[PDB]
Design a protein around this ligand. Structure first.
Ligand SMILES: [Zn+2]
Ligand SMILES: [Zn+2]
Ligand SMILES: [Zn+2]
Length: 610
């Protein structure tokens, strides 16, 4: 776990390796689909938000290596997330006090994408990195990833990575009378440069990262988003700052983001986000077994979103605003031999210039009976301040086709959370189970209106209104291996929410359906690793104020890897087939509930590691 400076890993946490992510999809929400707990809020082939336990947007949090993504994915699911899955070293899903180190109101879980912009190490044999290439049938995709590390002398290490994606209109099963879904194509390209130092003591690295996606918009010339993302960042960390401390960490950032929701070659809605995050973390010495780490964060996001109409005539959806976070945070764990008790805190001040104070804190205890055998309980009272969107909304959004309305008098989102989990692994039997339960004293949500003033899949109207809520659900998995050479297992998840006491007792908006999963993986022999995954997704009968029924399909995915150690590093061949039954995959979690996802599709790729 690289996200936490202080390691406070709970039983609920999990880390997917990089080699597997090259075989998975490119989008964050779609690639992480299959893992128990997280569902995909797919909005075409361009963007997809990860729905962690029926939570999304600002309720979750995504970080681009110990720093803010600087994106507008939290605004709506159609917006792309500025994180590179195919270029990342490893993705890691985390919960507990470590959530309070970065963001407020992170009730579901943190998802830090560790990338290789800055090496932080002298590469083996001078140079290192990787190269990739894969084509998907029916999409039709053309991915070409890349990554290079160069030893520029004794202690300097230069890094240069590249990526390019080109997917047309993907195929749909039994959708009226269409072979491919119109306006669902998604082209993209990503590249980054980074120069770093190497220890002892530590590293002092800079990095530039550029991205430019071009994707259509299903469900509305031709609707499409053209975005540009420039990121000027700086990372540094060493093991000996000054006496009485074990580590010093700093992650400066400047993420310039922009996207144009166009229709043909004309711009209907402009967007902008001048993020510039700064943070100074430090991990003090162990004061008798117990360890901790404190830090300060200074963030400033000058975001805005205008339309084709001028400012003099109509009020924009999101006028120019200058948000400033002045956050203080810290964590402290106490290792009592076979029992770890950790507690985090976070206090931040908001200055919305065109001043309330947030106060979050958590506490978690982890009992280890006989490692690996992790029993863990967690509870976190988190208070998230409302964004400028939730208060100052008064315009139309052409991509979703929904008029967003705000409110001048709203309170902060307080939330008393609680969750427990039991993990185990020991050759023959392996299983991870977890229960979560979230109470919200104040839960702001997009209440579908209704009139109103007058007069008005056509044109939707929403207003951010307060409400009490109560979420609860179970999630986990189990793997019984008869022989280490093979691997068999079963997984499952469930989520349920309601809204109690309005200023009654209705269901939550867009709740993911239950998904049982069957798993197989046979590695015969050594190099060739075959596998099979059957995800049975049931229908969601419990619908919200203004929603419809959603199935309810039998998903089936197969795969077959192939390792090879030749000259110039390792080679990784792989062939993956998705949805052999060709079922009509309708996702209620996403906004595009009536639109079916990609049907039958194949994949064949090669990745050279070195
Ligand atoms: Zn870092
Ligand atoms: Zn007005
Ligand atoms: Zn949008």
């Amino acid at each position: 776990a690289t996200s936490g400076l202080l390691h406070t890993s709970t039983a609920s946490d999990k880390i997917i390796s990089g080699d597997t992510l090259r075989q998975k999809a490119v989008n964050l929400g779609d690639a992480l689909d299959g893992v128990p707990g997280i569902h995909a809020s797919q909005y075409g082939g361009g963007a997809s938000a990860p729905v962690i336990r029926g939570q999304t947007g600002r309720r979750i949090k995504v970080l681009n290596h110990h720093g803010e993504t600087g994106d507008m994915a939290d605004f709506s699911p159609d917006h792309a997330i500025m994180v590179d899955t195919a270029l990342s070293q490893q993705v890691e899903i985390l919960r507990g006090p470590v959530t309070l180190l970065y963001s407020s109101g992170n009730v579901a879980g943190l998802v830090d994408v560790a990338d290789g912009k800055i090496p932080e190490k002298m590469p083996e044999n001078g140079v290192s990195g990787e190269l990739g290439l894969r084509l998907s049938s029916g999409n039709l995709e053309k991915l070409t990833s890349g990554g290079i590390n160069i030893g520029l002398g004794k202690n300097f290490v230069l890094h240069t990575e590249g990526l390019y994606r080109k997917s047309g209109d993907y195929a749909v099963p039994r959708y009226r009378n269409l072979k491919r879904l119109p306006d669902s194509h998604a082209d993209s390209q990503t590249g980054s440069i980074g120069l770093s130092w190497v220890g002892e003591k530590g590293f002092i690295g800079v990095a530039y990262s550029d991205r430019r996606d071009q994707y259509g918009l299903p469900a509305h010339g031709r609707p499409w988003i053209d975005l540009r993302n420039k990121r000027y960042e700086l990372r540094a960390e060493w093991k000996q700052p000054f006496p009485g401390f074990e580590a010093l960490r700093v992650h400066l950032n400047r993420n310039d983001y922009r996207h144009d929701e166009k229709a043909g070659d004309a711009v209907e809605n402009f967007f902008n986000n001048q993020t510039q995050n700064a943070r100074i973390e430090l991990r003090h010495q162990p004061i008798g077994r117990l360890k901790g780490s404190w830090g300060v964060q200074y963030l400033q996001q000058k975001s805005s979103a205008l339309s084709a109409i001028s400012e003099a005539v109509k009020q924009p959806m999101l006028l120019d605003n200058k948000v400033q976070h002045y956050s203080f945070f810290g964590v402290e764990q106490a290792n009592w031999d076979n029992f770890t008790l950790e507690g985090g805190v976070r206090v931040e001040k908001q200055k919305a210039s065109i001043r309330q104070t947030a106060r979050s804190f958590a506490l978690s205890g982890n009992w280890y009976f006989t490692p690996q055998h992790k029993l863990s309980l967690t509870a976190s009272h988190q208070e998230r301040l409302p964004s400028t969107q939730e208060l100052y909304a008064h315009g139309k959004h052409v991509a979703t086709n929904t008029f967003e309305v705000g409110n001048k008098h709203l309170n902060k989102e307080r939330s008393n959370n609680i969750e427990l989990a039991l993990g185990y692994e020991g050759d023959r039997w392996q299983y991870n189970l977890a229960l979560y339960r979230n109470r919200f004293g104040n839960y702001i949500y997009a209440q579908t209106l209704n009139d109103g003033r007058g007069p008005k899949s056509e044109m939707k109207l929403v207003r951010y209104n307060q409400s009490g809520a109560d979420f609860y659900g179970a999630e986990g998995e189990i793997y019984f291996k008869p022989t280490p050479r093979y691997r068999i297992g079963v997984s499952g998840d469930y989520v349920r929410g309601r809204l109690k006491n309005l200023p009654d007792d209705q269901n939550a908006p867009r709740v993911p359906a239950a998904r049982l999963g069957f798993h197989l993986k046979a590695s015969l022999t050594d190099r060739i690793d075959a596998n099979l995954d059957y995800y049975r997704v049931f229908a969601q009968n419990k619908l919200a104020r203004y929603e419809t029924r959603t199935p309810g399909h039998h998903m089936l995915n197969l795969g077959a890897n192939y390792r090879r150690n030749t000259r110039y590093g390792e080679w990784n061949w792989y062939v993956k087939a998705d949805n052999l039954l060709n079922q009509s995959v309708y996702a209620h979690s996403s906004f595009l509930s009536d639109t079916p996802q990609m049907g039958r599709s194949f994949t064949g790729g090669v990745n050279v590691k070195f």
